Amino acid sequence: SVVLGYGGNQDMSSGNSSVFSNDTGATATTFQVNILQDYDDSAVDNAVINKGDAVALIVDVNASFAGEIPERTAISGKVQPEFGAPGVISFTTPASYTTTLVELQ
Amino acid sequence: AVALIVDVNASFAGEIPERTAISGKVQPEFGAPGVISFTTPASYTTTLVELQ
Amino acid sequence: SVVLGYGGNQDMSSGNSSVFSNDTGATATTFQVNILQDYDDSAVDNAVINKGD
Amino acid sequence: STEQVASGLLINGITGSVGTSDVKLLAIYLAPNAGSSAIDLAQTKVMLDYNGK
């Protein structure tokens, strides 16, 4: 059972491409934050999401679980905010890996 | 009725050969997205090919 | 009534001949698998058949 | 909350251009669903997934 926290690295990639190719080297105990949409630039500094943003999270698995994640598994998890209601995770893995970028949910 | 044009050669740095399968989404601000699937044909014949 | 299972021997005979003359000596409780056509080599290892093999 | 369940976006046809060796331009047609209030094209973003990209 693994608890994470915020990591001191982010990006302002609103216009660029290749999500898996920029600033992914500050992992192994934290997650990383990317911004996809922000009109009134309220999330560029100090991480405040207003009504209508879009933010992606990147987590590394190999350097945080000390191993891998094989197929035919079932994993739950929660993303508890400070005071709201959590979103629940379920990504029961497919039985075959084909391409270099697989969908999970 | 609005059409969109995207260039592939100067955004993927390469090409898009046949017998592939690509997904994607066109998320609006607050609505529900439309899903893309354009699994390519096995032969290119004309200078303007249909995909979906 | 006979139930079989997968056997630990296969072949990549895509181009060769004489189906009844290569690697037929690991039988008697299992079956054996030969590959005749695979474009995107998704069945060469770990036995996954995609659309068209 | 009624505006979120009401609105939508409907894809109705995708064409592509070719002419050197391979496809390099995509054209996507588009039309709003018939309950949407006001779709604003200044803030709609397209994701694509191919070749580990």
Structure keywords:
two-stranded antiparallel sheet, 25% strand, globular, mainly beta, 105 residues, protein fibril, three-stranded mixed beta sheet, 4 chains, part of a larger assembly
Describe the structure.
The structure is cut from a larger assembly and holds four copies of chain A. The first copy, chain A, is mainly β. Helices cover about 5% and strands about 25% of the residues of chain A. Chain A has one helix and five strands. Chain A has one helix spanning about 60-65; strands spanning about 5-10, 30-35, 55-60, 75-80, 90. A three-stranded mixed β-sheet of chain A has the order 1-2-3, with no helix packed on it. The longest helix of chain A is centred in the middle third of the chain and has 4 residues, at about 60-65. The two termini of chain A are about 20 Å apart. In chain A, about 0% of the residues are buried. The interface of B and D includes residues 15, 30, 32, 47 and 52 of B. Strand 4 (about 50) of chain B pairs antiparallel with strand 1 of chain D, so a sheet runs across the interface.
Briefly characterize the structure.
This is part of a larger assembly, with four copies of chain A. Chain A has 105 residues and is mostly beta strands.
Blueprint (SSEs and pairs):
The structure is cut from a larger assembly and holds 4 copies of chain A.
Chain A: E1 5-11, E2 30-37, E3 54-58, H1 62-65, E4 76-78, E5 88-90
PDB class: protein fibril
Keywords: Archaellum, archea, flagellum, metal binding, motility, helical, protein fibril
Entry title: Cryo-EM structure of Methanoccus maripaludis archaellum
